[PDB]
RNA sequence: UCGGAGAGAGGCUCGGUGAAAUAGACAUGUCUGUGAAGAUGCGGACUACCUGCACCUGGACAGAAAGACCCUAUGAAGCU
RNA sequence: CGGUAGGGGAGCGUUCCGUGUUAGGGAGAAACGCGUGCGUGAGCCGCGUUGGACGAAGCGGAAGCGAGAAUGUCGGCUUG
RNA sequence: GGCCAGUGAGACGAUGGGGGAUAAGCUUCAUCGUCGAGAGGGAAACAGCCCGGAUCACCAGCUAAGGCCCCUAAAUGACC
RNA sequence: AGGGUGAAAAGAACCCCCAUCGGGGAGUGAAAUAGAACAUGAAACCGUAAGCUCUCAAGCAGUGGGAGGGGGACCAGACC
């Protein structure tokens, strides 16, 4: 359970990146809500 | 059983490369006849 | 694993689920239009329709059934006289699950419910 | 603006070839054009191959006919012509070797009881499965594999070995559906096969 | 410098971590004022509101300090950096006490107006330097 | 404070192509030397010899600056159609050369150490070579080999 | 009489910018740095011994690739029968270079040895 | 025997806050052999595209903690 | 003219002191960072759109004088 | 002799033996070789086995031990 | 345990973002990259931009050779 060591600058930036490009993911995703939030006739937010 | 193991050292007295052939033992390097003595390396010219 | 278990439960056990049922419900026929979660919605929307429904037929059975699910006294005699004139040749659908923008602080994916 | 990707590239290709100098061949070559000898000092020091060295579109081609061959003299002179051990640009970090084509793996001899007692046992990472195949069951099921499984130890198994692999064509048939250079009969030096 | 061209904007050591505001500000890096002004709006994060509100008081400062467009305006770089981290002796059981670290953020946001010349055509004149220095101001591929 | 402008002197674009395509290219000729190459052995060792070439070598025993210097231990003369193989040394041969001035190469970091057994030893070592220029390379038409 | 001292940061930064792409924590993180430094030094010693007896292999299997062209069973071997008997002192290996340089040439040797 | 289903709190995902023991640097395969006599690091062969997520803990002689057992100290102390 | 335990000889560096209110220095000292330079090496010398007031060499002396290790120790910051 | 240190746990190999079971990479001695304190080459790897004693440079040559099909330098060398 | 903005608070009038904190102009100053976390600011650590390069690969991450590519160049063969 106990880590025998340490991960490196290499390791951890691509760890950090694939979480960070996790969190790329769901802003195109909230592109198209925020365009389809724009003038048209939706029937969502009242 | 009672066949002792050769182990390290006594693996090298046995299993080292030994060239057990009375002819390849009597070879010496090869004899070419000699040559005169070749001249200067290098001669000041003024 | 879940196959075909088409019961809906919430994030709650199960009698603290029947009281979110009979509240949520309760005041989503008290106002009308209200906010909830999607889950909370549609939860919302199986069981107000068995309440449109069921006092669509105005007997006293129904009626006390109905008086029996719902909290409030005064709004479950505010729904027999209101259902047959409205919600007549409808025919199902009595509701509407227009989404918004979720919840800060949770991110909770949040719903709205009309009556139509 | 295509133009900018297509004209500055083709301005950059313009001025690869106004600055850049071709690399000739060695063929019917003298020591250096009076270009090289004002260029670096590339004789004193051992003489390294350039990308125009290597190419693969003008390496030779070679067919051997494995009908009545034994197996191993002819994997290893498969493997001195593979390396590029018979020419005279052979540096062993690149890949100076040549394509090889070996028809009729079916017909491929072999001396004593190789045929009944050699084994190309295999094995996956878990345990029993250590798989017994002796040389007439690969000869019967899949021939091509023979002479594969001999020049494969044959070759440095790095990641040049690997490379010079796939110059390795054997087929079991009579006919190699190859036209690719024309290839010339491989030259032989053994005379014990 | 790049000749008059961008508006850097700093900002204060903000109560939250940076790697969320990395995340947040790795995605709104190379996209103008108008897509990052709807993201922003709608983005479900935390650290999305001093980010909007940085770029907000970025543009309208890009619009007041600097005479630009909030439509021609992209975000240039968008660098967010550490900062002072608090230190929060928290105990925990078996006589034991755990350092806490509340992070802060250093966000500096750049921005970046096209003030642009849009010459004709490319063709090269090795003529005339000191005009040769005021022509070309932002372009690519610098040959000698 | 705004973007520049453009700037209206008007100006006409020459597309003549006589003036920058005669600026962009350069026209510079290598010198010929001559169709000649040898072998020398200086020192131990044997380079490749081409007259005008900046080599280095060895020698710092004793020989002084922009001196000229006949490198008579020459094998295996060659030209453009036939090489000269000698036995050992072409007869009456001259590969004439400029010694120039003495030089110290690059810093070869001899640094020695064992293993724990604590020994460590930062030495270095600047070999004492010389840069020769060569000349032209005469005394060579006798036995020709041609193929 | 406090002695605090910079010169361990001029001693440790000379090591410092020798250690340069040295692939992470070799090239960055100084307890690694010193022992870099060392196994760097120690590995120019024995691969220049080993790059004087690796061109020595080199030039070996490069002219024995060269002289094996003929087809004809003329080894590297008999090459030095006829390369000392025939009284050439000492080419060094450098015909190894003109073997590619001048492959004409080489031809010329070759079949001056032969005669 | 011989398990099976269901309800909660965790576990999984999302949004917030956010540690810890550990850590020479880690570009951290299997068999087999060798070696301070139990090797990802040495040798030969075979096998493996890179990198995550969720579980399991066989190894890293895993983490702890200068072995309570054994012995040594011209050690300490209690007791007889 | 390999070298552990170890012995001897010769040197570099640091801060202070004598020369010294030294030469030099807001026309940029010390620092910090840099080298296509020199040494057997400890190191010197030179260059810096950074910094802003001190301080060399030579000939000498004195040390809280040189760091990679002490489950060292004190601050900072990682891993998980 | 003067001044002044370490070391006093050795290990394997050949021979001469004792203890053992003429068992142990076992234990104790006597002469010697190596390692310890010894790099390089051969021994696949591998302190003690063979050659061999590393001041340094060379993109120099000849050899010892050992090898000359391929991986991997040199003979798919010759004759019994 | 926590010292040092300037020489002098001359400590930022006024405009914009704006609930503040903060930020940008302007103004003071020789210096505002001396802005109140304020003097030189190094390493670990976290980043962003530019050049080359990694997704059939076994490696104390080097070193010797160096394919291909990039940069300034002047002893254009050199250097990184």
Redesign the interface.
Known sequence: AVPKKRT???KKRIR?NI??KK??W??LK??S???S??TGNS???? | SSRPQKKGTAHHMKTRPKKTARWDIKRGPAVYPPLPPLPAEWTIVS | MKHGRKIHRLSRPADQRRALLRGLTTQLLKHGRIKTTRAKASAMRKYVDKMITLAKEGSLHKRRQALGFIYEKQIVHALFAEVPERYGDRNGGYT?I????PRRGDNAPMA?IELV | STKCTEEWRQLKEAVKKEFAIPHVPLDQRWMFTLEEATGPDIWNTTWYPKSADHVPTDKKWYVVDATDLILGRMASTIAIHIRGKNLASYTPSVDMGAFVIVVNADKVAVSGKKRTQKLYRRHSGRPGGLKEETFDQLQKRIPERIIEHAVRGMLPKGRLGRYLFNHLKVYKGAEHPHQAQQPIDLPLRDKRI | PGKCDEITTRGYSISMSV?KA???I??IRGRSYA?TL??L????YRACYPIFKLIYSAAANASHNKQFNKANLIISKAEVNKGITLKKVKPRARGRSYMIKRPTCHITIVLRDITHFDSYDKFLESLTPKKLIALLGLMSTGRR | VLPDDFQAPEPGTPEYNDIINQFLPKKGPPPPREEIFAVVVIGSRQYIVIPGRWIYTQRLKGATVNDKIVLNKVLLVGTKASTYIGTPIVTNAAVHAVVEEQLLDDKVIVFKYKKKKNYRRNIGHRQPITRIKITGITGYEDYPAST | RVKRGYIARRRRKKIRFFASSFR??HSRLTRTIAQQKIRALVSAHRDRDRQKRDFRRLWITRINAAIRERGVYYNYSKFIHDLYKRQLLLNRKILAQIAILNPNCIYMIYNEIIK
């Open positions: 490196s600058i290499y950090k979480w960070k969190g790329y769901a802003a909230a592109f809500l925020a365009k939030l724009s029937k969502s937010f009242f | 509407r227009i989404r918004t923008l709205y | 790697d990395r995340r947040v790795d995605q897509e709807m993201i709006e709608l983005m479900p | 992470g924590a």
